[PDB]
């Protein structure tokens, strides 16, 4: 899904002249990226603690 | 493209599952050799008795 979002931004870069607005959808896309990052942090932390107890 | 994606997905699932089973199978074999030499030594000493 991260790759899909990146591709969607990439296609969005194809817009033209006065039809390139800060459509709040793009703000939501940025928050999409940051949500993914937070999830990844949580996952890796849990993996680490599992390793120590192993 | 939609179907092509889930094709790859099921392939990946298969990969993961098969690798896990392989690991534990080879573990069991590694243990059974030890059992084998145990019984062989037992045979030797009972013959001596």
């Amino acid at each position: 899904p991260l790759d899909v979002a990146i591709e969607c931004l990439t296609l969005r870069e194809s817009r033209r002249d006065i039809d390139v607005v800060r459509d709040p959808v793009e703000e939501e896309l940025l928050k999409e990226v940051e949500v993914i990052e937070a999830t990844k942090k949580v996952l890796q932390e849990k993996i680490s603690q599992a390793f120590q107890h192993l | 493209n939609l179907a092509f994606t889930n094709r790859i997905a099921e392939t990946v699932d298969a990969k993961n599952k098969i690798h896990t089973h392989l690991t534990k199978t080879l573990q069991e074999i590694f243990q059974i050799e030890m059992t084998i030499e145990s019984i062989k030594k037992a045979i030797k000493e009972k013959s001596a008795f």
């Binding site: 899904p1 899909v4 591709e7 969607c8 296609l11 969005r12 194809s14 817009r15 033209r16 002249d17 039809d19 | 493209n1 939609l2 179907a3 994606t5 889930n6 997905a9 099921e10």
Partner: peptide, 29 residues
């Protein structure tokens, strides 16, 4: 002309999120 191009681009980027419907499955019933 420019407006039509914008519309077509929007539909194009819309469609791809059928990918995010898992491996085209239900997961939860």
């Amino acid at each position: 002309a420019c407006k039509t191009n914008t519309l077509l681009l929007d539909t194009k980027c819309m469609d791809t999120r059928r990918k995010l419907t898992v491996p085209a499955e239900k997961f939860v019933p």
